[PDB]
Design a protein around this nucleic acid. Sequence first.
DNA 1: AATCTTTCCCACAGT
DNA 2: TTACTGTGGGAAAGA
Length: 414
Amino acid sequence: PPKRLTREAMRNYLKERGDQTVLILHAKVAQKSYGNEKRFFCPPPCVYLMGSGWKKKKEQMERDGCSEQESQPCAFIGIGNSDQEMQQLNLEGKNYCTAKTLYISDSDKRKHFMLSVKMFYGNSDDIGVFLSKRIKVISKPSKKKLKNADLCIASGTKVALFNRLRSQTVSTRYLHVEGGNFHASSQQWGAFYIHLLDDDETVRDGYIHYGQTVKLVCSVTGMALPRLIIRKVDKQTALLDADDPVSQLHKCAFYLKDTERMYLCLSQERIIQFQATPCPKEQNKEMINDGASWTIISTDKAEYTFYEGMGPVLAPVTPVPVVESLQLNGGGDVAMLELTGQNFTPNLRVWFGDVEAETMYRCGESMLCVVPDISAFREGWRWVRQPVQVPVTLVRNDGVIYSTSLTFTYTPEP
DNA sequence: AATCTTTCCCACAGT
DNA sequence: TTACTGTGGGAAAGA
């Protein structure tokens, strides 16, 4: 039968933390296909397997007699209904795989959907079903123009940047940090924070408009580009006088501030600067290189982390709970902690460090638990003598551990 | 009338 | 050459 997590096994986990993590990276918007069209999601949704637990799991399975294909994690992806209209992803040799041929027909009437990722090992042992964040279905890019918060880009949020032509032999390329440099990758795409700057030269809020100075920061490596002025393009000109909101899937260019019309530009797989030509017709326009035209789109991320605290289990690890936030109560006579998040179940207990707490399930989004007494952690303490911080972890009845990034602090009373 | 969003159509450059 | 395929741009339709 399945075993409950022991205090010792929790201690061992807390010491090492070899979690298995599934990340799903995708755009927040998808353009619908009309008729027999296939307009593929771009950038292509990406599944990443993160953490040292994938290697540990793989070694455990092979020691127990699995071959390499049997221990290989497998993934299928689709857009959230029936059927095995799900497309296979190849994760062999890679950390990750992109879903390059997903689309949504106009016969689908949903205004929003989630990607569904189904995972199992090559021996057919179920891992489970992992959901993306919400994706809004759009008809096509505008323009021009804010009341539609969903179609605008807020300062501090993440964007992908890709470079297309209508038809080319060469692969669509995506801004992606790799090998210690910004590159225009055919295989992976980065998500960049887009920071609006005080254009004097720090954080400034609100939505991004053409003609504003922004900083692009890789959400993964923290690498940053120089100050850029984001400008609007149509066909092959950057419009110098546009100042309307930047919107989903619009073409734009990045003029390197204080430069003699140099723009961020791709060259094969390299990111360079290229000089625009001044345009004799009208002076409020500059002709740009095709490598200097980028499509911008807001990006999101679903992340699930799990660990077999008591060894292999027969139930899938999913639905994986995610804790958004922690709220202290008091309240009743008991010190209570409220957890808000997703995928909660009555088979979960909140653990404070290596101490299991009485936990009350309310719904998939809410749980309460009894804050252990400080002596719990500090033997003989009859009150909080100095601050004590402990990790908060969710644990399932079969010993699977769902780590949280959150802690709880006991603070001395003033 | 006017303006905006959705759907439909076509042509490009690659198979 | 003709036939077929995603994609951007622009026309037509619907709101």
